[PDB]
Amino acid sequence: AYHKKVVDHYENPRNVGSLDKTSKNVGTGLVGAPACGDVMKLQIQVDEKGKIVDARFKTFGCGSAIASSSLATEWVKGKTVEEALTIKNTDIAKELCLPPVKLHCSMLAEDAIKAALADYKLKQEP
Amino acid sequence: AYHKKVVDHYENPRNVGSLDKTSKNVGTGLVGAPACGDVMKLQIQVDEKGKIVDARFKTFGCGSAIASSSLATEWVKGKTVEEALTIKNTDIAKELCLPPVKLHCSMLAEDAIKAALADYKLKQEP
Amino acid sequence: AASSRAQVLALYRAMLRESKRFSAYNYRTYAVRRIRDAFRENKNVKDPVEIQTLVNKAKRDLGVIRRQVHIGQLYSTDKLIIEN
Amino acid sequence: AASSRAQVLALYRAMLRESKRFSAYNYRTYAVRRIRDAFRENKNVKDPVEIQTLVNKAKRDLGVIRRQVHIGQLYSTDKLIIEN
Amino acid sequence: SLRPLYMDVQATTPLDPRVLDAMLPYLINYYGNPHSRTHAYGWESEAAMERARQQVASLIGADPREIIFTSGATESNNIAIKGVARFYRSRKKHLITTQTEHKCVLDSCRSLEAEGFQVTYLPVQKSGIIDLKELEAAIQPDTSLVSVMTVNNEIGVKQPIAEIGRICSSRKVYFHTDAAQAVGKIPLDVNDMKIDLMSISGHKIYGPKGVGAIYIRRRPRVRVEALQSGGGQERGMRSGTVPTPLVVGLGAACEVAQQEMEYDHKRISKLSERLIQNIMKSLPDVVMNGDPKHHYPGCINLSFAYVEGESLLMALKDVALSSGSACPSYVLRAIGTDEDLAHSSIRFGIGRFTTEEEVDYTVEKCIQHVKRLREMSPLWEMVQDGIDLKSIKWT
Amino acid sequence: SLRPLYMDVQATTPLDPRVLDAMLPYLINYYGNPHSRTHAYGWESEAAMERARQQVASLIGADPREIIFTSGATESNNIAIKGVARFYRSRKKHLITTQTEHKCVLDSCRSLEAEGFQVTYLPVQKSGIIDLKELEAAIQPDTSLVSVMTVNNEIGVKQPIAEIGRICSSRKVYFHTDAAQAVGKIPLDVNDMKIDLMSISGHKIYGPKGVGAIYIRRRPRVRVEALQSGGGQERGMRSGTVPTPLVVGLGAACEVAQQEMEYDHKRISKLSERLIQNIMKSLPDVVMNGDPKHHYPGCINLSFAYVEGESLLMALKDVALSSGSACPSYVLRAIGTDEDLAHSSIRFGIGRFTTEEEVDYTVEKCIQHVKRLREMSPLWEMVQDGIDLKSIKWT
Amino acid sequence: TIEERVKKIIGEQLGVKQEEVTNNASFVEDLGADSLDTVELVMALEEEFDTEIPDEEAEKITTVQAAIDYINGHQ
Amino acid sequence: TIEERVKKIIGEQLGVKQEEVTNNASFVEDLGADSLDTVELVMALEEEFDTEIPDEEAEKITTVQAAIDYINGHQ
Numbered sequence A, B: 001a002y003h004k005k006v007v008d009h010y011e012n013p014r015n016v017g018s019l020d021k022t023s024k025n026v027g028t029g030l031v032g033a034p035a036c037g038d039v040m041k042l043q044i045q046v047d048e049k050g051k052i053v054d055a056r057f058k059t060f061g062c063g064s065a066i067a068s069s070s071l072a073t074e075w076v077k078g079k080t081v082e083e084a085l086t087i088k089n090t091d092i093a094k095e096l097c098l099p100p101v102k103l104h105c106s107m108l109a110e111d112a113i114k115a116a117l118a119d120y121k122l123k124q125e126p
Numbered sequence C, D: 001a002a003s004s005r006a007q008v009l010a011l012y013r014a015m016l017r018e019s020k021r022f023s024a025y026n027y028r029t030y031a032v033r034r035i036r037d038a039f040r041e042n043k044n045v046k047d048p049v050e051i052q053t054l055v056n057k058a059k060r061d062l063g064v065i066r067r068q069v070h071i072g073q074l075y076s077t078d079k080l081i082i083e084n
Numbered sequence E, F: 001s002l003r004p005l006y007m008d009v010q011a012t013t014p015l016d017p018r019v020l021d022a023m024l025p026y027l028i029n030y031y032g033n034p035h036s037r038t039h040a041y042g043w044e045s046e047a048a049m050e051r052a053r054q055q056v057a058s059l060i061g062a063d064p065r066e067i068i069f070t071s072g073a074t075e076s077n078n079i080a081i082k083g084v085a086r087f088y089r090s091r092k093k094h095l096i097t098t099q100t101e102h103k104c105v106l107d108s109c110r111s112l113e114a115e116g117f118q119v120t121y122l123p124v125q126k127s128g129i130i131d132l133k134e135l136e137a138a139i140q141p142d143t144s145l146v147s148v149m150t151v152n153n154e155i156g157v158k159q160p161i162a163e164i165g166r167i168c169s170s171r172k173v174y175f176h177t178d179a180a181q182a183v184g185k186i187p188l189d190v191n192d193m194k195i196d197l198m199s200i201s202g203h204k205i206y207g208p209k210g211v212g213a214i215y216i217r218r219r220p221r222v223r224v225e226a227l228q229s230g231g232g233q234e235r236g237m238r239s240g241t242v243p244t245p246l247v248v249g250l251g252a253a254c255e256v257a258q259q260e261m262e263y264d265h266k267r268i269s270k271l272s273e274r275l276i277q278n279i280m281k282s283l284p285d286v287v288m289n290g291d292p293k294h295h296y297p298g299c300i301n302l303s304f305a306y307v308e309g310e311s312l313l314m315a316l317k318d319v320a321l322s323s324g325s326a327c328p329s330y331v332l333r334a335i336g337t338d339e340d341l342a343h344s345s346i347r348f349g350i351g352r353f354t355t356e357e358e359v360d361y362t363v364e365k366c367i368q369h370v371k372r373l374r375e376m377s378p379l380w381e382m383v384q385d386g387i388d389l390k391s392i393k394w395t
Numbered sequence G, H: 001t002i003e004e005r006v007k008k009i010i011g012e013q014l015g016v017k018q019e020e021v022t023n024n025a026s027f028v029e030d031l032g033a034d035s036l037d038t039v040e041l042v043m044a045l046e047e048e049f050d051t052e053i054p055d056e057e058a059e060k061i062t063t064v065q066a067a068i069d070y071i072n073g074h075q
């Protein structure tokens, strides 16, 4: 990774870690595949009003995958669950100035957001 | 021409010139063709005992042609007409260290010797 | 502010003096002639910006001349026939 | 006749001192190490002819080092991370 | 800004100062065209070209008449593979190579298949080494050429070149080896190895970029149809102006390598063992790709499980390295590497100018950043919690 | 020993010191492979490669995306001629070129004829210039390519490139020009001239040997089948490691030439007129080969009747010149020169670094030695005695 | 060939007949030189007399006599 | 870290414990050095003390004390 913006998410890591998968207020998205070189785990913690109050991630993947998923984890904090649904792969790519060969990284990070939000939403129905 | 031996026949010319074609004691050999890039004129002067006492040449041609015909002109002096007949293209090439691409030059110089000697011999029969 | 005229005349002398040190005849004679012709060609430029661009290019070329003179001395060869 | 031992020890010092002037880390460190290893490897050669050949090669390489040190100073660049 | 350590010599090398020194006269006053036959700029340029030809020949045990200059081993590989295939095509349509060859061999073979040639791409063992008896079995009556590289550019593995030559010579099949990563680093002798063609790259052996050579055996005569049309330079095999300064630099690099090969091999062996051993004793789940028993030590390809290779290269911000790298890797796939581990491999190169300090710095940063990336990795998290990754339904 | 004057710039040129200066950093510390994507040696090498690409493009009015680096104009000519012919061969089998093209164009065309292509080798007028209306008439419905060089390397004649482009564009036939002897010396603009492909040689324009480029127009798109197989460098058109120092030197030579072209043309014009006029006013039977009205002044080819050219070159022992020379001449034959006069021609080259003193020295020695060789020549003897050489029965 | 080879150098450099190169003449005001000419003229005197003329001395050499005087005073 | 950092340099260069680097010891006869070692040792003292030691002085530095003495006498 040659962009300052991308490398910063590795040299100055933020929100790397895990949340408690058993919580009714945590959603976990795990997307990608080791054989494809990119696996993103993104977890969100939602308060009882539906605001995301925290998030963590872990990513196996190139620098642009780490930055895309790290940025996604920052960006969901402070958003309602419905707001977080509108974060787009294109906004992440724009912020990180991703070249076209790394656009699949921003699309996987958007997938990770939605998988986490869907896991949370499935837990609230009962 | 890259050999010292070849260039010497141009930088230090010897026997360049003409003899009197009307003399019964002069033989003139004119061989080659302008279109082939090599024309040699070699003339010999024979005394009344059959010894070649002088020779001259002129040559249009590359340095190796000039040297081959110049050397031939030196070499015939002091030889009888029959001795001069045994000068071979191979002796001229050896003396000048001619590479294979210039061997046609030593063969033309041998042709020039024989044309001159034949012209002289034709004049003695009457 | 720097004096464009002072820079220019100092650069002219420096570039000529250094070019005269070229070991190789064809680089030396070209460099001296080209410097003379170029400064004279540009004598009547009046735009201060364009003058500064020309000065900066001459400073760059002075560095080139200095380095290529030294390299040509490290790897010098015999003079040409006509330098005798 | 020249002294092989005197030539050799003078060349050793000269070649080490000049190699230490290489601007570039990888040429400098290689040249110093290679010179030390080569003189030590050849310490016990006894044939005066073979010694003279080795000395002549070292004089040639000293010229190479001198020229390439100067060229590397004319076109130098930043140090490597590990020279800090 | 301070510059990164160069640990990437399989991609290209710096000039050896002795090579640049030999080249510089030809960039300054000896600038004649070596094909100019009528004056001294030509003569001295020709003479330097022919001296360099002898230097290349001496390193590999050839006759200088067998050395043709090219612009690189890429061009040499095209000439050897297409030139032999096209020459003998009236009687022979089958070629053999391997699945781990450099891309220019493979793509030359693919272009010939589009031309109606049959090509067998031999598999390799998980060691990276071909199976000699499978090579023997693959030879057909119309097989014109076998091509197998001497040292692999990604993983460093050494193919049994002399034993391949025995097989090919005994069956009158021409034997080409791409020796770009081997010339000047391990012994090469075209007669002892029974080689018929060989590719050489100047910039893999501390010579300049833009030059190479091809060895073409003259006895028994190997015939090649020329690819580059023109006035017949290089015995009609490679028309074009021979670039005197570059071929001078190639010959100088070959002569220097002939002198330095034993010293470099000893020194690089020690540095390579140090790098491999010190990484492996400090990190779990590190695997070397390629058999260390048949391996050129200056090329070390390791996988770091649960870390993606490009992120590790990013993390090693002050070391110049490579991954998945043609000097997901098809070489790693061909040796049976799991696809995820193949995404986790990087290549370390140790060369003539590498220091112990560089090796130690590289090792120390590699240990630190593998640990860090593992602590960021969901795969390492899952394994640490005792999960079988081979049990997950991905995507 | 003192060295001869260099008067042979059509065979090759010395480096301009500005070009060597730009190259040297890449021969010393910036030695990365420009295709190494993961570290700063690669990044800075890539960046230098792309700057050089823009410098080449700016000189000829192209988009840098249209510039492909090669090892020389020989390779560029092969790529343009074989690459276009092979790409469009399903619908187009006919190519047109001229009888005075450089040997790599002619031999590329000959190789395609052996491949089943039809090739028209247009004659030229005795001026050396093609007949535009004969070109127009030669175009067929399956003509894929016309190739005509901008400046001839032996006689210096300028072909009407822009008018050829008008003809080809209007008929949707691709137009290639070998511009090796023209780039940086006369104006070239690919759009005004309607050029589709162009060949460029670094060492004809004071850049280093071993490098060139090919312009390939992207709009309207010209398609070329690649010749050198490999990993897809140079947009898949020229696989192989791009040699950064050499392409830096090519770009620098192009930028310098863009700046120096007008100054050089004025200066070389004056020296060329001086050389031609001072030889012709002092020797009878001297003829210029090629029309001076459509002629690049730095290339002067003269015949000296009754003197063979190689002997004159030998006699001019301290001047480096050329004869019959691909940068008995097929170019001189094609313009209708008598065979004997064609054996009597030599080429004088005047370049960026030539001095008036060199010109005057060359003129004075040429007058002296033509006279001397005529005094040794049997043909001059015969003409002086009033013999019609055209009346003799030779051999 | 006295040390007024200085006159020959000045005349050659400035394109002026030897008759018009008077001892009193200033290069600029009297002989048509500009400051590029006078840089070149000072270097030509340096070359001809194997002498190094530094800037503070060069700026004083503005007339034929000043040139003559400087060279006589430096061997 | 007195100016018998000289002892540290000698011990480092010659592979000899600091205990055996006595003031009286000659490099060759007492500490096992050959003349390649002593070239390198003199350069190491030059480097460590930013001092240039010419040949006629280097040939006199054959003992630990001679090294100590030379360096104390050149700042």
Ligand SMILES: *P(=O)(O)OCC(C)(C)[C@@H](O)C(=O)NCCC(=O)NCCSC(=O)CCCCCCCCCCC
Residues within 6 Å of the ligand: C004, C005, C008, C009, C031, C034, C035, C038, C039, C042, C043, C044, C045, C046, C051, C054, C055, C057, C058, C061, C064, C065, F017, F018, G034, G035, G036
């Ligand atoms: P004088 O008569 O008092 O003053 C003379 C000047 C030029 C200073 C005066 O006329 C003036 O001030 N003009 C203003 C315009 C000006 O300054 N022009 C000069 C700009 S600098 C310039 O033109 C440099 C051109 C550099 C060419 C170098 C070629 C090098 C080649 C090397 C190759 C290896």
Ligand SMILES: *P(=O)(O)OCC(C)(C)[C@@H](O)C(=O)NCCC(=O)NCCSC(=O)CCCCCCCCCCC
Residues within 6 Å of the ligand: D004, D005, D008, D009, D031, D034, D035, D038, D039, D042, D043, D044, D045, D046, D051, D054, D055, D057, D058, D061, D064, D065, E017, E018, H034, H035, H036
């Ligand atoms: P001392 O203990 O009194 O004497 C030491 C010597 C070596 C002088 C003594 O042992 C002796 O006289 N031995 C005789 C044999 C001999 O002289 N060996 C030395 C020959 S010179 C030699 O080996 C030079 C090798 C040069 C290598 C240079 C590598 C350069 C690389 C540069 C790259 C850019």
Ligand SMILES: O=C(O)CN(CCN(CC(=O)O)CC(=O)O)CC(=O)O
Residues within 6 Å of the ligand: C020, C021, C025, C028, C029, C032, C033, C079, C082, C083, C084, F357
């Ligand atoms: O300034 C120039 O044009 C070149 N030279 C003079 C060129 N000389 C050749 C020489 O000095 O050997 C001209 C010649 O002798 O033809 C100046 C200098 O000597 O520094």
Ligand SMILES: O=C(O)CN(CCN(CC(=O)O)CC(=O)O)CC(=O)O
Residues within 6 Å of the ligand: D020, D021, D025, D028, D029, D032, D033, D079, D082, D083, D084, E357
């Ligand atoms: O002799 C050597 O091995 C190299 N250097 C020391 C190399 N240095 C780098 C530097 O001097 O900046 C080692 C380092 O700092 O890693 C000697 C010298 O300084 O002349």
Ligand SMILES: *Cc1c(COP(=O)(O)O)cnc(C)c1O
Residues within 6 Å of the ligand: E010, E071, E072, E073, E074, E075, E102, E104, E149, E151, E152, E153, E178, E179, E180, E181, E200, E201, E202, E203, E204, E210, E211, E212, E327, F240, F241
């Ligand atoms: C580098 C390399 C090549 C290509 O060589 P170039 O000189 O860059 O064209 C070919 N094969 C292998 C194994 C290489 O490592």
Ligand SMILES: *Cc1c(COP(=O)(O)O)cnc(C)c1O
Residues within 6 Å of the ligand: E240, E241, F010, F071, F072, F073, F074, F075, F102, F104, F149, F151, F152, F153, F178, F179, F180, F181, F200, F201, F202, F203, F204, F210, F211, F212, F327
């Ligand atoms: C020199 C030249 C060539 C060949 O160029 P290289 O760069 O030497 O391969 C091709 N055409 C012409 C007209 C030339 O003059």
